[PDB]
Point group: C4
Chain length 201, copies 4
């Protein structure tokens, strides 16, 4: 009701904004498609909503909502549930469209991404062309080294992702420094298979 009415009303304002700025018809369609995928006809102020509840219910809700994400990703599946919960409560849902460059090589990285659904392509000068899909994550290397991105990552399909900011990543690893090692091992494995070696891990 108010959730479906909010979607319509908010989308209307998007239409008037695009009209005001005279965006072309293809660009408008693209934005429309993204809106459909990202919100699916409803809008919630999830912040305000979760902010009315308490810690325990928020945590119970986030665990319920991400059951498949958690169970399909060994890093989350085998870890301390308190660590899992601390990660989940800071994740932000994002949708990307095919061809979008989620991450650009060389740039400075402020987030990593957990793939709920979709396929992306890790691209590099080298020619290394590796896919990643449901149950994996990426963008973690630059958060561990605080270097620049080691590759570009491009959306092949529509991608439903959950992002985690560099600040929250670090706040979580402060409390659970055990799990930093689990990220570094895979990060090393991955760099290894694109002729890279970082002494920082």
């Amino acid at each position: 009701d108010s959730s479906r009415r909010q979607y319509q009303e908010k989308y209307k304002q998007v239409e008037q904004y695009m009209s005001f700025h005279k965006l072309p018809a293809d660009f408008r369609q693209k934005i429309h498609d993204y809106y459909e995928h990202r919100y699916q006809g409803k809008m919630f102020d999830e912040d305000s909503i979760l902010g009315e509840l308490n810690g325990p219910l928020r945590e119970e809700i986030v665990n319920f909502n991400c059951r498949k994400l958690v169970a399909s990703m060994p890093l989350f599946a085998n870890a301390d549930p308190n660590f899992v919960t601390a990660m989940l409560t800071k994740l932000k849902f994002e949708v990307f469209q095919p061809g979008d460059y989620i991450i650009r090589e060389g740039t400075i990285g402020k987030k990593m991404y957990f793939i709920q659904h979709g396929v992306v392509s890790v691209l590099t000068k080298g020619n290394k062309e590796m896919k990643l899909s449901d149950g994996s994550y990426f963008g973690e290397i630059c958060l561990l080294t605080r270097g620049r991105r080691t590759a570009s990552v491009r959306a092949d399909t529509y991608c439903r992702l959950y992002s985690l900011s560099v600040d929250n990543f670090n706040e979580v690893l402060e409390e659970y420094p055990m799990m930093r090692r689990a990220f570094e091992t895979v990060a090393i494995d991955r760099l290894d298979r694109i002729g890279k070696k970082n002494s920082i891990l």
Copy 2:
């Protein structure tokens, strides 16, 4: 009027959110029950409201609202009224349900809690099983030592609590360092009766 209408409208959005995420019927009931207890059919933007007033009226209102809390808790009852007021204006009302773990042992603590109404259980590896009830507080030990929580605390009944963040606790003790001692003495007493000794107090 607008306060009762706000509750209904806000709860409706909660229902649509739960529906959207397909939460089970028991979880929905649990969230409904919490809402009833936490808001009791009305919603106020207490922030905005208090922000329209001045310092003196805010302080007069918070003292009126917490008269029983203040008078039933010797730490507040016997102290400097300016200290009391400074604590009260920073307290945040929270409701917990039976079985909820308000605090987990070993974790890092960012708040303590004053019990307006309810019973909680301080749980520890040891086997020490102590209850606390109306007029007491907990969660203070980790704010004084900045260690990890010394025990878990679990709600036995519905609990009406007022929380105080670690930042506000410290801002208040900066202005009134006299009262830090009053927290440390009880903290020592409590650690003593669970075979703990911290040299930090």
Copy 3:
């Protein structure tokens, strides 16, 4: 229209809040009176409003609104108009009721106050009983020394004041350190006539 309707609607929510907390009839009247004095039947989101404009119009508006304040107070009347403007744009309007203690001796001070209209009483252990009225200011001593308040200040009548936070005071004196001296001289004069001497000025 929407400004008068906002006042009514906002006051209604205040009434429901007071009712919810069961405040006594005298306290309710007091809050009602304050509301009348503070808002005079209208409410504006002056922030949002001024935020739609630019720097030059904001500055022109604040100067227009405070013409009598500026012209009646020699510190503002004789100074650099850019300094005046920088002070004015950071001032916050506040109303106090008779008997209110605006400032308490011994406490830590985070603001000073410019009197638009009203009489206050500077009170001290000593017995020094000095009035201040339209065109003067107070609360500046603790901002210059960062000590504790040197006296208590109490509202004799309804007081229309403009407050300035310690952060903004300092940001303004950074840009115009010339004017710090003008505050210190009066501050010294005032301390002198209550048997105080601070070497910090």
Copy 4:
């Protein structure tokens, strides 16, 4: 619809605010004119709007909206598109009226300005009287030296500008320190032709 209704409604609140403060008729007209120029009958919460989208669409939208600004200004036209995008996403649209002093000499500078449309006059004690117009920028010297403004800049016509804060300027030059040199060269050229020499560039 809601965008045109928002403009009207917001302007109405401006009228009631001006009425409340008893602004004169000329000042009211001036504010009305600014509103027309600045919003052109529509209001969007561009923040909220762009915040519903993702990084790639925001970036695509900002590039589309500023095509003429980017293509007419060699600094942007010939640079790395990622640098351009990083600048554009932080720019804030502002409108100034004829006679307005956008920048005052001697003051401390917290922003620079890119001229979308309009003519301004760089004024100095000296007597140097230089115009700048569509496709140029100003206010950059104080951001590079962190001194005081080297001149005053005054609007000759209505000016459509995009401002960039000192914090964002620096965050962008951190990532692309190559382009600081491009600002310094012009800054030196400009100081040279008003008998100034700063060793800081």
